[PDB]
Design a binder for this molecule. Structure first.
Ligand code: BMA
Ligand code: CA
Ligand code: CA
Ligand code: CA
Ligand code: CA
Ligand code: CA
Ligand code: CA
Ligand code: CA
Ligand code: CA
Ligand code: CA
Length: 187
């Protein structure tokens, strides 16, 4: 807790959606958009496996389709934009050990854990899956996590899967392990 407002506790990350009619080319562009204004919509990111879809995430009802099971928590239905993306932040329960992300995306993204980037694509791309380098968690518990992802137009997809067993199996980040505040969620 960092201010005088109570924060919703749920088994998910705090999600913000931002749209723009400018071009998003890279992580810096999307982060500047996030910085420039209040979110166009907020939502609870409880099942982080979004898309695939076509014909721009920022148009029509494409954001709702993309977010699927998390769209029922949208604060509003944003108007049309050409480009858009999401900023997620909260906590993820991880035991101490070694992990790595494998992320399928169109366009780019960046995931950080405890302040350190652990999966980065700093450019636009048609759908592509990267197996990222491993990282360590030093102490079991809720780890701080944030993510950004965007769509510059066209197709869109975002599924960042995590392995705890050296890339033999991967899981989606969902309500089993996510927390909005770092307290234990019970529903
Ligand atoms: O050039 C068009 C294509 O550009 C790529 O980088 C992706 O953003 C696609 O979703 C888009 O359709
Ligand atoms: Ca607060
Ligand atoms: Ca903002
Ligand atoms: Ca809309
Ligand atoms: Ca879906
Ligand atoms: Ca739902
Ligand atoms: Ca664009
Ligand atoms: Ca795209
Ligand atoms: Ca392990
Ligand atoms: Ca496997």
């Amino acid at each position: 807790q960092d201010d005088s407002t109570p924060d919703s506790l749920f088994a998910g990350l705090v999600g913000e959606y931002y749209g723009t009619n400018s071009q998003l080319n890279n992580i810096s562009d999307f982060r500047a958009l996030v910085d420039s204004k209040e979110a166009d919509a907020t939502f609870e990111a409880a099942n982080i496996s979004y898309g695939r879809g076509s014909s721009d995430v920022a148009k029509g009802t494409h954001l709702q389709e993309f977010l699927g099971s998390d769209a029922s928590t949208l604060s509003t239905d944003p108007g049309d934009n050409t480009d858009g993306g999401i900023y997620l932040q909260g906590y993820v329960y991880l035991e101490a050990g070694t992990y790595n992300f494998k992320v399928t995306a169109d366009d780019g993204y960046e995931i950080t854990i405890n302040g350190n980037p652990v999966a980065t694509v700093d450019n636009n791309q048609s759908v592509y899956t990267v197996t990222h380098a491993s990282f360590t968690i030093s102490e079991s518990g809720y780890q701080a996590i944030d993510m950004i992802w965007w769509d510059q137009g066209g197709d869109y997809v975002f599924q960042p899967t995590l392995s705890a067993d050296g890339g033999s199996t991967y899981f989606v980040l969902d309500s089993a392990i996510l927390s909005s505040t770092g307290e234990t969620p019970y529903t």
